[PDB]
């Protein structure tokens, strides 16, 4: 399964699954500051799933590793902004992270394999 380009549609499909998860709703658009006035005092680099999908569709990811770094920033931002590890929204982030990691592992493996096969000679 040595298609170097296959990761892109596999990531589009996984983002569609994430958008169907009720657990994604807080992460689907950039945070608003009128409701969370201290956000940018805590979080240096905001990230959300609409920004990830737009970056993919623009052709501005070169690999699934880059997409994975931005998705993991969504989750690290939630863990750093949360006032409690028992937060509703943080709790939603941890379920969504487990789902994402379960599904991204084969996408990363297949891409890295494809690149090694390309450079086999």
Ligand X SMILES: O=C(NC1CC1)N1CCN(C(=O)c2ccco2)CC1
Stretch that binds ligand X, among 22-30, 49-57, 61-69, 110-118 (CB under 6 A): 22-30
75 forms part of the interface with ligand X (CB under 6 A): no
- b/e burial code for range 81-98 (CB count within 10 A of at least 16 → b): bbeeeeeeebebbeebbe
Q: Which residues contact 58 (CB under 8 A, 6 or more apart)?
A: none
User: Are the C-beta atoms of 43 and 81 separated by less than 8 Å?
Assistant: yes
55 forms part of the interface with ligand X (CB under 6 A): no
Tell me the closest approach of the beta carbon of residue 61 to ligand X, in angstroms.
22
91 forms part of the interface with ligand X (CB under 6 A): no
99 forms part of the interface with ligand X (CB under 6 A): no
């Amino acid at each position: 399964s040595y298609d170097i380009q296959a990761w892109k549609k596999q990531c589009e499909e996984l983002l569609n699954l994430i958008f169907q998860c009720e657990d994604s709703e807080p992460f689907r658009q950039p945070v608003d500051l009128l409701e969370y006035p201290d956000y940018r005092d805590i979080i240096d680099t905001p990230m959300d799933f609409a920004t990830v999908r737009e970056t993919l569709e623009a052709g501005n990811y070169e690999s699934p590793m880059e997409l994975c770094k931005d998705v993991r920033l969504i989750f690290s931002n939630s863990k750093a902004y949360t006032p409690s590890k028992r937060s509703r929204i943080y709790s939603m982030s941890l379920r969504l992270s487990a789902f994402f990691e379960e599904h991204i592992s084969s996408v990363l493996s297949d891409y890295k394999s494809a690149l090694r096969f390309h450079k086999r000679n």
